[PDB]
Every structure is written in structure tokens, then in C-alpha cells.
From Swiss-Prot, chain A:
The gene is hsdM. The subtype gamma methyltransferase (M) subunit of a type I restriction enzyme. In the presence of the R subunit the complex can also act as an endonuclease, binding to the same target sequence but cutting the DNA some distance from this site. Whether the DNA is cut or modified depends on the methylation state of the target sequence. When the target site is unmodified, the DNA is cut. The lineage of its organism: Bacteria, Pseudomonadati, Pseudomonadota, Gammaproteobacteria, Enterobacterales. Type I restriction and modification enzymes are complex, multifunctional systems which require ATP, S-adenosyl methionine and Mg(2+) as cofactors and, in addition to their endonucleolytic and methylase activities, are potent DNA-dependent ATPases. This is Type I restriction enzyme EcoR124I/EcoR124II methylase subunit. Belongs to the N(4)/N(6)-methyltransferase family. The type I restriction/modification system is composed of three polypeptides R, M and S; the restriction enzyme has stoichiometry R(2)M(2)S(1) while the methyltransferase is M(2)S(1). There is an equilibrium between R(2)M(2)S(1) and R(1)M(2)S(1); the latter is methylation and translocation proficient but restriction deficient. The C-terminus is required for assembly of the restriction enzyme complex. The individual domains assume different positions in the enzyme, allowing the holoenzyme to regulate the methylase, endonuclease and translocation states.
UniProtKB/Swiss-Prot annotation, chain C:
SMART domains: DEXDc. CDD domains: DEXHc_RE_I_HsdR, HsdR_N, SF2_C_EcoR124I-like. This is Type I restriction enzyme EcoR124I/EcoR124II endonuclease subunit. Residues 266-411 form the Helicase ATP-binding domain. NCBIfam families: hsdR.
Length: 90, 104, 992, 52
């Protein structure tokens, strides 16, 4: 999306019609702001389970020829929520 | 899962590029797509399965030309029969085995 | 009491608005509130969840908390990471969850009362949120959705109207115009393939019910709808929800009603307790058998259930029984110790076995514990080996059986005459599904059965009906004479490409079969067809031959059947002489020499040779199949329209023969052409009067030739089937042809008239006199030898030829103009995109194709003389694949026909010139908008080998000039490049 | 309980573990029998497996 203005942090530019074209090309929008490099700024931030909701984003992918339904690996064990936060942040 | 992410890491096009889950002895797919043109494989060894066999898998499209099944302790050549089923008119094929399947 | 109730008085609105939807909506709201469906009003997403919390606490009799209800909504009910198929799996299998109550316990959560349907609660609500919606809540769950249309809305347009969260539960997409009403599942296909899965509720006599008011009044009872939606909706693993047609559910409930009544009367092991189901073949009896088996499994007091067919249908359908997963479809094969182990093993609650395995078990073992147990039997495909004897062992070595039958073979009035009949074997005709209304409901097609009274020599012997002499005095000369066989061969080789719709080179085509009653006939036939095709190819070095194959082994071995069917061939290879056996072997060697196959005629290669021939006769790669006794009962061929018979047949073995054509394929195939060389129409009348009234045969077959020439008015419905010459005179007089139609309503009416014309055309295409009349358009003046030889080909006396010369057909150039005009109107309504109403005859546009070979053949024949207006004739013929238009002109406006000697030279000169122009224009495609040469050349050659182009192939940016990271990517020039290249590949589909 | 085997349903055993776990008088030695959890993919799988 930025082979040429390259931005470390990105925006909520909202243009869905433009969003669906990598959703036809790579089949998946990462998100507006739920990329890794944006998430790498707010590390150690409570809480960590938003990554589950992060896996909701590329798993939309119903158009076309999904190849999704894949990323159910990172479950939670885990014994306390702060254990989960510290371990996954590390 | 690790196979799909493995093939996804290497900057490969989305086009039709996939693997489906299942077993070739139980869910042989895809017949309709297509008679293939090149295949490689690493079938595991001594992979004993249901015997011998309770369904009509003698009378499928690929084991009836052989004449007999591949029983439990000799469960290897079902893979190579399934391999030679999905082949073109010209394209070669290559599989691995161990030489202990000798006359058996 | 039942689901499909018989006695139903009907209602009548007038009304009670004639046209509108919202008043019909209020009508059905009033009707369901009369029936006991609660109409409440919910308008938001969260109040749905509030209603669900209201209902599930009533159901399970428990109390949630707000955090607990939230945890149940999150963890089990509404995980957002799940699709429609997951919730379908939940409502059909996973209907129980387990929930932690906050006093530290774990109890069950139901969804639907799967065993006590009346304890469920029902609700009805209305629309939100491009259409009108009426939704039924089943314990607060949206499962049944009903839309609405106008009155004159076509049923095809009823699908063309195709987030939120909890509308991913729906199963039954009931659709109606207020006059017709159908129901979907799974939202399967687009509008092109929805009509396969369009069903109708009806009464048990199969008479249809279409009116939406009485559809609602009958089919939408709570005890009806819940039992349908729970019990008769099979989630076949995976991805599929198979939901039946109503006669199957009716037959199943008749079965279980008779079982329950027979056990309450304690009247077992008797034909009073028995009975039978006689459904016609093609009704999908296997799924009904499985449902009966699963419900006998679900029964209370039943120990063992058995399902028995003939060999070796068994293990094939046994692996086709995988509706349940796993379905416990166990076999011994052939393990009587294993079968009694399966008797000793528990909860394989369905067992499939043969009559031979059962008989081996009974004669080998007579001390089983099953002999005083509750046992259910279902049988199918009864031949006559153990038809009474295994039943005598069934009477002898059992005490408590409920024996039921599925068949297409009634026995009682005149079938067998020497056996125990079906009603005396089984009992009551519990429920039947005759062929008639199945034909009416578009599952199979109609008949045209004609005898070929064509030879006055053997006319008395063909029309002979003395069954004693036809059985006995059948020989090789009075009934298999070489002149007789020769004229049969000449008839079928003249009429093949007409009856298989191969009148054009680019036509699709169909394959055909020819079955007889004697092997020596077939041994004559193979050499006969081969030699006469050799002579036909040597007549003018132009005749396209036909690949003709044949197969048989041995024999009419026993009686094996009633009167009258095919005696089944066994698998003994060389039981006949080598005058038959090595003849077959040499035919198979020629088959190997032409097709590069490996099957010998041993005990192994012959059977799989039969299977391989069966598979490759299906794909229209075998032109003609000569048949002795195979391919008549269990073989299916969806691409086979025409059957030829030189044999005398009987009640319903002949019906099994006629079933080998009538299966539906598309709108081209309309009915099966039965062409017999011996008259058998009275046997057909016998079969249909056996299977219905005198109205039944007029429902089934056909009307006569003139009754389709000038059409007819149907005596039942009073429709105006106007007629061929009628519609011809209509289009000549009404429309000042060719292209003087500019008002849009008369454009639409001209489209409708021309579509009706081509429909009647395709119906008439299978008629011999109509073929002779069309081929009369190639008159000679005089050339009397050729004219008389033509009339001898079509068996035309000059008496009838007087009227045939008198009757005049419309001009073919006019028809070219009409079809071009129809194609132009279709292309004009192909742009954007009173016009969303028009019926399109897409299929016969897809039919009757010319793949440039007949075009270049005419151009080579276009001497030399005319040289300029022949380009105008080619621009007349340019339609159907017209997008390759101008460059064909650029082959002939640039080069010279004097440079090209014959057909093949101008053909590969056209290929060379097309490749050269394609490369040269592809250069301009590169140059025009900065196309990266290797990437774009790779893309276009991929699209050409792929035969179309796509906006996928997502490395297309490598073809693209500069940059589409940018958010102001404005299809620049992506849509322009893409439209140009799809126009380019449309210009070069296949060529180059 | 051995009389009513294969009877729907099976999760009453969880409630069965409520019974000896009362045991507050005296010197409990309870809070022990949390081993038999549920996996398990359908309720009929659970019923058939635990009954077997």
C-alpha cells in the first residue's frame, strides 16, 4: 500500500471502495490501524486479547475464494490475564 | 495449518494456490481438477488403515486396475496407485519409498 | 395426525387485495395468529437477544444473569468468527450446549425440542432491513423467511434481489407471487441454477398446491412445520442441507404409522402388518430409504433394522449412505460370523445386507438370538432367484418381522401370472408416487414412440403380433434379412445427425443407443455398420463416419423376471462360442487400436472394460452404442436423447428401457425419441393404462405432427399453442421486416414472438416430416435422379410430395435477419445492463453455432463470378460469435481467394494471418498505455490459454505502468487496460 | 446408576460430584474430583463415550 508515500503510522482514511481492491488482490485488508507496526508502538499495553479481534479482520475475506478460516492457533493458556499480557508482550 | 502458512510465506500468488484437508485413501480429491502433469510426494511408511476393506474401495477408479488392495502391514503402494491415477498423457511422476517394499 | 393431510377444503380471496403485498402480508399475519403463531414487534438487534433470553429461560427452565447471558452470547451462541454452515451444524447437530451456572455447576442448554415438538414456542415478526420480509422465530430464532412480489412477477426474477448478525440462521427461503409459492435452502446458486432446487408442497396424491393462502393454511401448521424443519432436513456432511419433496415425507409417515398401529394391534409378521411403497424411478428413493432407516433407528422398541438390495448395488449405495456421519453402514462381505457379530455388536443400528448373505445366514445358522426380536426389513430391486424361497426362509426362521418394499415393479394384475404378487407379498399400497406427476413436475421428460413402417417387404412381419411365432419363428432371414438390416442401417445413418441435433458443424450433439433381442443380429450389425460406413465414405470422400461400439457377454440365462423385462447377463466371458466371443475380442482389439486402451477380455479386464466404456459413452465421445442386454436398468445418461429398438417388449421392462432417455438435461432436450422398427405402441398403451387413465397417456407422450404444425388448443387448460405456420404468418404480417421496429414495447413483443417461434422450432426439430420439409428447401430443377433419390431417402411418394411442394416455408435469409435482430436487441439490453421483464432464449442461441469452419468452407466454395457481395453474405452470417467480425473481413479484404487453392489452405492461411494480426495488435496494446512487456505478455498468454480474462491474477500490477500503492488509484488505467484486454481476448477466444 | 446406563443425559455425574464435596464437617479433605471435564465435541459423543 505504500511502495512510494511510505508511513510508519497510518490513518483512518475510511475509503472502503479502495479497501476492497486488495481484498480482491491479496484478499485481505490488514486494517486501517491494526497493523503490526502500529501495534508495536503500544506494546505492554493492557490488554492483549485484541489480537483475537485482530484475527477477525483478515478472516472476513468472503470475496473471493476465501482461503481463510486458518489462524485459530494462538489460544489462551495462560492462567491469569496478567500472565497472558506479560507473556504475549514478551 | 503450518503447511498453509509455510506456502503462504514465500510470496506466492493467491490465484488458486491451496491445499485441502483430508486423507487420499478416504477423501480422494480433486478428481475433477484435474489429471495432473507432475507430482512429488513423501508418503509415510507402515501406515496401516481400515481392512481389508469394509467399503467397496476395491471397486473405485484406481484400485480396480491393480487387482487387489494394499493391506495393513503393506499400506504403502495405495499412495503410488493414487499418484499414478492423477497423471497426464505425457508428464512424469516421482515418489519416494524405502527398498524394503521388495516383493512383500 | 399426519404431515401430508389428504382431505383439505380450500379458501378463496378476491379480495383482500388483488394486487398489493402489504395486505397479503397482513392476511398471512392474521392467518398465523389464527393458527397460533404469536405476532410481536421487535425492531432492534438487542431486543432480539432480549426475546431470546425471554424464550430460552422458558425452554430450559433456568435463570441467567446479565453477565451470564453475555457469556453465553459470546462463548457459544454468537461467536462472530463463524459462518452460516457452523450455525446450520448447530441447529441440526449441536443443539445442546453446556453452561456454567454461577453457583459453580454445569447444566444443559437446548435450542430446539428435538423430541417433543409441541413444547417449542413460535413467533412471527416483520421486515427490517430493498424488499418486504416476514420472519418466523422458532423459540426466538429466525429460520423461515418469506418475501413478497407483485402478481405478474416471473418466478425467475424472484431470486434476482441478491450483515446483520443474527440473520445467519435462516434455512427456508420461501418465495411467492401470491399464486405460486416455492421454497429454497442453502442459497445455493445464481438464477441460472436455482430451478433445480425449487419444490412444491402438495397433497399425498401428488396433486399440486400452489396458492399462497392455502399453502400457508396447510404447510405452516406448527406440528407440520416443526416436524419438517427438524426431522426432514439432512445436513449431509458437509456443506449441504438436503431437504425433501413432500411425497417422501408422506411415505415415511405412512410407514411409521403402519408400524405403530401393527405393534399396538400386536399383529406382526403378516401382510396386514406389511405393505409396500411403489414410487417411480427417478424420485430419489435412496434418501427416503435412509430417512426411514434412521427413524426406525430412532424408534423405541425396535431391536434390528435391515435394508436389502440386489448385487452389487449394495456396497456402492452403502458408501452413498454417508448422510449420517458416521452412518454405521456395516457389512460382513461375506461374513455370516461377522454378520452375527454385528448382531452381537450394539448400536450399528442400521445393517445393509444382500438377499444372498441373508439366505446364507439362515441356511447356515438357525440358532440366532434375533429370532424373537423386533425386526424391520426393507427390500429393493427384486429379481426372481430367491424372490419366494428366501421369503419362505423368512417365514420359517423368524417370528417378528415388519417387511416393506420399494420397487418400480408391480406384480399383481398381469405382470408375473405365476407368482405371489406384491400386494400378497407385502400388503397395502401404503403410498405411491407415479411417473405422471413427476413428468408434470419437470423431473423427467416426455416420450415420442414411433414405429418405422418403412419396408413393405417385411411390413406384415414387422406388424405381426403373433407372440408364439415371434418367439419361435424368429430367425436370421425372415426377421434379420441382410436387405432388412441394410435398410435399417441406411435409415439410422440418414437420421442420426438430424435426431442428435447435429445438423450444424458447431452443434453440441447427443449420443444414441440401439438395442435388440439376439446376439447374432449384433454380430451382423457391427460388420454391417462398418462396411456401410466404408461405402458411404467411398461414395464421395466427404462423409463423416461414426464411431460405433458394442458390448455384451452372456446371456438370457434364466427366466429371472416377470412378463416382461431383460434377463440379466452374467459375467462369464467365453460361455458363448468364439464366433461370438473372439468376435467381441477382435472388436475390442479394434477399440484398443483406435483408443489406446489395455482391457483384455479375461475375467478382470472385461468388467472394468464395461465400466470404462460406460464412463466414456457418457461424455459424448462415442457416437453409437449397439446393445444386447446391458445398459438398460441401472445406467444413467443425461446426454442421451434418442433410442432405437428392434425388439418386442412388455409392461414395464419397456418402461425401464424408456427411462434410459427421459432424464432432464437443459432446455434443448425436451423428450425422448423412441424409434422402434417393430410396432409396440399398444404395449405402451398397456403400460400407461396399467399406470393411469386414458388422460394419462396424453399427459405423458406427445401429440401428432399436424397438431404441432398448426399447433393446437389444449383440451385441459385451453392454452393457445398457436402453431408453426401460424406464428410464421404472424411475424410476416405484423412486423414490416427486418428492422422497422423502434418502439420499445414492440421490440419486446417481437422478442417474445421470435422466442416462441424458436421454441416451437426446437420442438419440431425431432420430427421426420419436418426434417423432410426443411430439406425440401434444396430443390433441383429438374435433376430427376437426385430428386427421386432424395424422396427415396425420405420415403416420399409423389402423392404426398405434391402437398409438400405446395406447403411453403419462410425464407432462410429472413430468419438470418431475425436472429441477427434478436442478437442485436440482446446486445442492446446487454449494455445497461420496461426491460427488466423480458424472457431470453439463451440456450438455443448457445445452440446452432458455426465455428468458422463452415464459414471458411462456404468462402472457399464462394466462387470466384461473385467476389464482392460474398463479403456481404459473410456479414449476413456473422452472428453468435460476431465479436470476431471485422478481422475476418480483414482476411478477405486484404488477401486474395486466388492465392488460396482449397479449404485447408485458406484455413491455415487464416490461422497464420490471425496470429500475425494478433501479435501486431498486441504490440499496440503494449505501446498504448505503458505496459510492461514481459509481464503483460505473460498475462495475456495466460488469459488466452485460460480462454478468458479476470481482475484476479493479482500480479496484474506487474503489467501496470507505474503505481497502485496510492489511495488516489482511480482505476488508472486499470479499468481502461482491463476493458481493452477483455475486448482483445473476446476478439481472440481460442484462435492464436 | 449402573441400572440406567446409556440414559440421556450423562452430565448428572458433575452434579454427582457435588454430593461428597459437601463435607465441611469435619476436616474436609475434599475439593478433589475436578478431573473429568468435557471434551468432547457433541453431547451425544459425550453420552456414548462416557457410557461406554
Amino acid at each position: 500500500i505504500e511502495a512510494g508515500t511510505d508511513d510508519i503510522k497510518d490513518d483512518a482514511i475510511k475509503t472502503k471502495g479502495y479497501f476492497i481492491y486488495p481484498s480482491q488482490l491479496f484478499c485481505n485488508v490488514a486494517a486501517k490501524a491494526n497493523t503490526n507496526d502500529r501495534l508495536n508502538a503500544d506494546l505492554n499495553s493492557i490488554f492483549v486479547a485484541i489480537e483475537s479481534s485482530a484475527y477477525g479482520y483478515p478472516s472476513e475475506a468472503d470475496i473471493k475464494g476465501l482461503f481463510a478460516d486458518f489462524d485459530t492457533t494462538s489460544n489462551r493458556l495462560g492462567n491469569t490475564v496478567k500472565d497472558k499480557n506479560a507473556r504475549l508482550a514478551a | 495449518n503450518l503447511a498453509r502458512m509455510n506456502m503462504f510465506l514465500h510470496n506466492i500468488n493467491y490465484d488458486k494456490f491451496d491445499i485441502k484437508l483430508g486423507n487420499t485413501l478416504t477423501e480422494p480429491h480433486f478428481r475433477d481438477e484435474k489429471p495432473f502433469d507432475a507430482i512429488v510426494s513423501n508418503p509415510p511408511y507402515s501406515v496401516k488403515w481400515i481392512g481389508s476393506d469394509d467399503p467397496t474401495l476395491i471397486n473405485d477408479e484406481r484400485f480396480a486396475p491393480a487387482g487387489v488392495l494394499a493391506p495393513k502391514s503393506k499400506a504403502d503402494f495405495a499412495f503410488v496407485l493414487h499418484a499414478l491415477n492423477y497423471l497426464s498423457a505425457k508428464g512424469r511422476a516421482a515418489i519416494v519409498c524405502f527398498p524394503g517394499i521388495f516383493y512383500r | 395426525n399426519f404431515i401430508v393431510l389428504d382431505k383439505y377444503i380450500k379458501a378463496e380471496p378476491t379480495g383482500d387485495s388483488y394486487q398489493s403485498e402489504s395486505d397479503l402480508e397482513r392476511e398471512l399475519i392474521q392467518d398465523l395468529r389464527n393458527q397460533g403463531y404469536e405476532f410481536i414487534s421487535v425492531k432492534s438487534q438487542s431486543a432480539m437477544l432480549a426475546n431470546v433470553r425471554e424464550q430460552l429461560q422458558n425452554l430450559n427452565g433456568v435463570v441467567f444473569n446479565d453477565s451470564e447471558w453475555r457469556r453465553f452470547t459470546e462463548q457459544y451462541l454468537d461467536n462472530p468468527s463463524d459462518g452460516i454452515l457452523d450455525k446450520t451444524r448447530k441447529i441440526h447437530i449441536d443443539y445442546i450446549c453446556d453452561f456454567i451456572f454461577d453457583d459453580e455447576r454445569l447444566e444443559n442448554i437446548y435450542l430446539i425440542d428435538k423430541k417433543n415438538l409441541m413444547r417449542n414456542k413460535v413467533q412471527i415478526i416483520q421486515q427490517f432491513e430493498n424488499r418486504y420480509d416476514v420472519t418466523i422465530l422458532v423459540n426466538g430464532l429466525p429460520l423461515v423467511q418469506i418475501e413478497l412480489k407483485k402478481r405478474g412477477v416471473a418466478i425467475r426474477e424472484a431470486f434476482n434481489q441478491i450483515e446483520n448478525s443474527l440473520f445467519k440462521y435462516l434455512q427456508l427461503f420461501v418465495i411467492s407471487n401470491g399464486t405460486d409459492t416455492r421454497y429454497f435452502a442453502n442459497t445455493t446458486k445464481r438464477d441460472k441454477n436455482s430451478f433445480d432446487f425449487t419444490m412444491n408442497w402438495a397433497k399425498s396424491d401428488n396433486t399440486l398446491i400452489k396458492d399462497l393462502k392455502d399453502f400457508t393454511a396447510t404447510c405452516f401448521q406448527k406440528h407440520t412445520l416443526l416436524n419438517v424443519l427438524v426431522n426432514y432436513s439432512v445436513f449431509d456432511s458437509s456443506q449441504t442441507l438436503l431437504v425433501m419433496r413432500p411425497y417422501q415425507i408422506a411415505a415415511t409417515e405412512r410407514i411409521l404409522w403402519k408400524i405403530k398401529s401393527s405393534f399396538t394391534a400386536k399383529n406382526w409378521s403378516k401382510p396386514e402388518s406389511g405393505g409396500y411403497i411403489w414410487h417411480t424411478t427417478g424420485s430419489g428413493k435412496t434418501l427416503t430409504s435412509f430417512k426411514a432407516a434412521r427413524l426406525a433407528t430412532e424408534l423405541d422398541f425396535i431391536d434390528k433394522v435391515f435394508f436389502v438390495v440386489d448385487r452389487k448395488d449394495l456396497d456402492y449405495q452403502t458408501m452413498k449412505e454417508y448422510q449420517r456421519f458416521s452412518p454405521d453402514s456395516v457389512n460382513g462381505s461375506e461374513n455370516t460370523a461377522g454378520l452375527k457379530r454385528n448382531l452381537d455388536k450394539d448400536d450399528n443400528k442400521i445393517i445393509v445386507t444382500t438377499i444372498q448373505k441373508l439366505n446364507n445366514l439362515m441356511k447356515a445358522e438357525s440358532d440366532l438370538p434375533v429370532y424373537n426380536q423386533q425386526v424391520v426389513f426393507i427390500f429393493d430391486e427384486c429379481h426372481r432367484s430367491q424372490f419366494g424361497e428366501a421369503q419362505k426362509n423368512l417365514k420359517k426362521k423368524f417370528k417378528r418381522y415388519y417387511q416393506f418394499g420399494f420397487t418400480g415393479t408391480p406384480i399383481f394384475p398381469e405382470n408375473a401370472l405365476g407368482s405371489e404378487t406384491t400386494a400378497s407379498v407385502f400388503g397395502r399400497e401404503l403410498h405411491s408416487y407415479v411417473i405422471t406427476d413427476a413428468i408434470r413436475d419437470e423431473k423427467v421428460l416426455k416420450f415420442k414412440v414411433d414405429y418405422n413402417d418403412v419396408r413393405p417387404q417385411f411390413k406384415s412381419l414387422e406388424t405381426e403380433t403373433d407372440e408364439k411365432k415371434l418367439s419361435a419363428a424368429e430367425n436370421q432371414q425372415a426377421f434379420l434379412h441382410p436387405m432388412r438390416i441394410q435398410e435399417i442401417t441406411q435409415y439410422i445413418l440418414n437420421n442420426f445427425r438430424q435426431k442428435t441435433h447435429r445438423t450444424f458443424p458447431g452443434s453440441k450433439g447427443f449420443n444414441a443407443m440401439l438395442a435388440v433381442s439376439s446376439v447374432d443380429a449384433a454380430k451382423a450389425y457391427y460388420a454391417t455398420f462398418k462396411r456401410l460406413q466404408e461405402e458411404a465414405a467411398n461414395k464421395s470422400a466427404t462423409y463423416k463416419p461414426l464411431r460405433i461400439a458394442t458390448i455384451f457377454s452372456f446371456a438370457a440365462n434364466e427366466e429371472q423376471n416377470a412378463i416382461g423385462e431383460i434377463s440379466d447377463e452374467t459375467f462369464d466371458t467365453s460361455a458363448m462360442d468364439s464366433s461370438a466371443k473372439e468376435f467381441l475380442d477382435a472388436a475390442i482389439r479394434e477399440y484398443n487400436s483406435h483408443f489406446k486402451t489395455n482391457f483384455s477380455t479375461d475375467s478382470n479386464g472385461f468388467q472394468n472394460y464395461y465400466r470404462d466404456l460406460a464412463q466414456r459413452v457418457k461424455n459424448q465421445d462415442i457416437d453409437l452404442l449397439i446393445v444386447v442386454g446391458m445398459f438398460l436398468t441401472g445406467f444413467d445418461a443425461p446426454t442421451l436423447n434418442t433410442l432405437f429398438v428392434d425388439k418386442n417388449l412388455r409392461y414395464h421392462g419397456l418402461m425401464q428401457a424408456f427411462s434410459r432417455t427421459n432424464r432432464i438435461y437443459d432446455a434443448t432436450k425436451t423428450f425422448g425419441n423412441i424409434v422402434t422398427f417393430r410396432d409396440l405402441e399398444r404395449s405402451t398403451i398397456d403400460a400407461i393404462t396399467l399406470f393411469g387413465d386414458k388422460n394419462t397417456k396424453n399427459v405423458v407422450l406427445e401429440k401428432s405432427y399436424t397438431e404441432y404444425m398448426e399447433g393446437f388448443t389444449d383440451a385441459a387448460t385451453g392454452e393457445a399453442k398457436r402453431g408453426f405456420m401460424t406464428v410464421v404468418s404472424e411475424l410476416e404480417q405484423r412486423f414490416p421486416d427486418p428492422t422497422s421496429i423502434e418502439s420499445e414495447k414492440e421490440k419486446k413483443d417481437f422478442v417474445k414472438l421470435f422466442g416462441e417461434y424458436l421454441r416451437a422450432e426446437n420442438i419440431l426439430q425431432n420430427y421426420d416430416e419436418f426434417a423432410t420439409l426443411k430439406a425440401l428447401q434444396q430443390i433441383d430443377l429438374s435433376d430427376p435422379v437426385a430428386v427421386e433419390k432424395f424422396k427415396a431417402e425420405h420415403y416420399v411418394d409423389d402423392e404426398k410430395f405434391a402437398e409438400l411442394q405446395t406447403i411453403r416455408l419462410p425464407a432462410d435469409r429472413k430468419i438470418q435477419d431475425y436472429r441477427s435482430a434478436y442478437n442485436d436487441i440482446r446486445d442492446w439490453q446487454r449494455r445497461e445492463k420496461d426491460w427488466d421483464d423480458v424472457v431470453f432464449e439463451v440456450d438455443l442461441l448457445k445452440s446452432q453455432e458455426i465455428n468458422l469452419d463452415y464459414i471458411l468452407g462456404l468462402i472457399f466454395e464462394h466462387n470466384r463470378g461473385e467476389m464482392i457481395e460474398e463479403v456481404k453474405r459473410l456479414i449476413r452470417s456473422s452472428l453468435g460469435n460476431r465479436a470476431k467480425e471485422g478481422l475476418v473481413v480483414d482476411f478477405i479484404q486484404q488477401t486474395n481467394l486466388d492465392d488460396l487453392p482449397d479449404k485447408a489452405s485458406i484455413i491455415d492461411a487464416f490461422f497464420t494471418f490471425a496470429q500475425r494480426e494478433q501479435q501486431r495488435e498486441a504490440e499496440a496494446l503494449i505501446k498504448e498505455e505503458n505496459l510492461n512487456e514481459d509481464a503483460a505478455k505473460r498475462y495475456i498468454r495466460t488469459s488466452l490459454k485460460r480462454e478468458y480474462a479476470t481482475e484476479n491474477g493479482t500480479e496484474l500490477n506487474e503489467t501496470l505502468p507505474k503505481l497502485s500503492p496510492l489511495n488516489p488509484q482511480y482505476k488508472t488505467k486499470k479499468q481502461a487496460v482491463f476493458q481493452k484486454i477483455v475486448s482483445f481476448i473476446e476478439k481472440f477466444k481460442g484462435v492464436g
